[PDB]
From Swiss-Prot:
Keyword entries, A-Z: Isomerase
The protein, known as: Putative glucose-6-phosphate 1-epimerase
Enzyme class: isomerase
Key word Chaperone present: no
Catalytic activity, EC: 5.1.3.15
Active site: 166, 269
Function field: Probably functions as a hexose-6-phosphate 1-epimerase.
Assembly and oligomerization: Monomer in solution.
Keyword ATP-binding among record annotations: no
GO process annotations (BP): carbohydrate metabolic process
Family the UniProt entry places it in: Belongs to the glucose-6-phosphate 1-epimerase family.
Amino acid sequence: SHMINKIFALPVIEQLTPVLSRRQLDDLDLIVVDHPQVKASFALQGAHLLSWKPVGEEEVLWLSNNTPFKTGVALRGGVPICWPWFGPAAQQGLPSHGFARNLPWALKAHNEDDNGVMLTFELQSSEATRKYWPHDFTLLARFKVGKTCEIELEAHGEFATTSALHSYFNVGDIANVKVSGLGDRFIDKVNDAKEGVLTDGIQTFPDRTDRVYLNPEACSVIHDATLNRTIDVVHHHHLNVVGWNPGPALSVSMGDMPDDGYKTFVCVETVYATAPQQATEEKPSRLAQTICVAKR
C-alpha cells in the first residue's frame, strides 16, 4: 500500500464536497473519498474502486505498486469491473475481461452522511464502442463506502453478457490465507478446466490457483492469520464465485504487478460466467458484492 498512500497524498484539483475530491495520478483522474469513517479511492477509468479502508482497519483492497495509470490501460488491483465478457475474449485481438475497465465513466451522482459516501458512475455505448461490441447499453456502478462497502453493477440494454467484480483483497501473506464458504464443485482453469470437489468449502492458495466455484455460499470468508482478521464477501445476483492468485511465476511475468505482489493478495470475485446473463428493456442484468472486515 505505498501506492494507495501516494494517492491520498495527491493535491486536490476539485473539492466536490468536504469529503470528496478529484485528483490526478499521471494520466488518470481519480475520485478520492477522505471521510471520518472511510478512505476510498476510484478511477473514472473503469469506475475502478482502487482502495478501501474503513477507519481503524488495515486497507481491505490490494493495489499494485506497479500498476500503470495510463489512458485505456487496465488498472491492476482494486475491484476491476469485468464487462461485458469475463476472461479471454471470443475474438483474438480483444482483451480479457471486457472493455468497461478501459473507458472513462462519468461520476453521475453522489451523496454523503455521517456514515459514508454513495457514488454512481455511468458508462454509455458509443459509435466507438460499437465497432467491437455491436450493442447499445448504459452501464451503472453504484458504491456505498463506509464501515462496509457495497458495490452494485447494473446493465441496461438487450443483450447477453458475462461479467465479474474482480476484487483484490489485501492480505498479510498468501501463505496464511484460507477462504471458506466456497461450497463443493469447482472448475480448475489452471488444470484443463477439470472439475474438482471441496469437502468443506475451504480453498488455500499454495501457488497459482484459478478456480470457478459452482456452488458457493452467498458469503465467502477470507481468513487471514498474518493480519489477524476475517474479510466477509457477500455475493448477489451472481452465478459463480472465482478465487484466484497468480502465484510467483505469473506475478513476475506480469508487467503491472511486483515480483512479490502475489504474496499480499487473494482475489475473491463475484462473477457471472458459466452461463450468459440476459438484460432486457424491462430487466437489466445486475451483479453485486458486499464487503465487511472484523479483526481477530
